[PDB]
Design a protein around this ligand. Structure first.
Ligand SMILES: Nc1ncnc2c1ncn2[C@@H]1O[C@H](COP(=O)(O)OP(=O)(O)O)[C@@H](O)[C@H]1O
Lengths: 80, 88, 69
């Protein structure tokens, strides 16, 4: 809020939380990202990115080593 | 404006050139353990520039694809971002 | 349970191509996300092959090696 960053990266900040706090931060970033900042996260708890508007899946693949592959998923065409 | 998308070459389980999707106002990167996802953030910091230790890596010749095992993909890596801002 | 649900889902048509969007035609957001993660974890166990080429389309699921028929 003092010195803005054009976009954000957030590593798993929903660490030990329950559904209430993750709902708090998700609602905050939904109301606050839309006109202040881009923000991208990594998570596992489904409600946090339930509020998301786009999703980046990655599938790892076997071989001599791992090769990861990208796919994209829309989220802004769904009810409630 | 914001960051549109990111391009990577021969860096942390990313063989060749693959165009990562355009970034909306709030997206997310989800996947199980060991899926190779924090490395995207590592590349973000790398093209922004930061010391190697915080990227869980040393000597910065291990960052190439295949180097942690011991056999690098090549001696050659690109990383590239595109910033999108208003005014087209 | 999801593996057997796909086993009957394949046998109804037999076109070896399961649509993600077809399964979530008449459900809410939460169960649709649960189904998406279900396809994800079934892909993880190497039981099924899922194809998606362009950045935004429906995901095509076909039986993999460990499909259990
Ligand atoms: N250049 C590389 N080539 C192949 N595998 C790698 C490479 N660098 C790291 N890995 C491995 O990939 C696995 C996935 O973890 P990592 O890529 O660090 O991201 P994340 O923590 O998101 O899973 C780890 O076991 C890591 O050691």
């Amino acid at each position: 809020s003092y010195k803005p960053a054009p976009f954000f990266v957030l590593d798993e900040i929903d660490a030990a939380l329950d559904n209430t706090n993750i709902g708090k931060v998700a609602n905050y970033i939904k109301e606050q990202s839309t006109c202040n900042f881009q923000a991208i996260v990594i998570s596992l708890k489904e409600e946090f990115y339930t509020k998301a508007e786009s999703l980046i899946g990655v599938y790892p693949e076997q071989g001599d080593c791992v090769i990861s592959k990208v796919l994209t998923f829309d989220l802004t065409k769904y009810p409630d | 404006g914001f960051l549109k998308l990111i391009e990577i070459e021969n860096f942390k389980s990313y063989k060749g050139r693959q165009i990562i999707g355009p970034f909306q106002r709030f997206t997310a990167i989800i996947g199980p353990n060991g899926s190779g996802k924090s490395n995207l953030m590592d590349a973000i910091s790398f093209v922004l520039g930061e010391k190697t230790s915080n990227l869980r890596v040393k000597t910065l010749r291990d960052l190439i694809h295949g180097a942690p095992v011991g056999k690098p993909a090549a001696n050659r890596a690109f990383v590239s971002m595109v910033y999108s801002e208003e005014g087209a | 349970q999801m593996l057997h649900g796909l086993q009957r889902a394949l046998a109804k048509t037999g076109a070896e191509s399961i649509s993600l969007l077809e399964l979530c035609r008449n459900t809410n957001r939460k169960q649709a996300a649960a189904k998406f993660y279900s396809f994800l974890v079934l892909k993880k166990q190497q039981a099924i092959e899922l194809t998606q080429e362009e950045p935004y389309s429906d995901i095509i699921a076909t039986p993999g090696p460990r499909f259990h028929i």
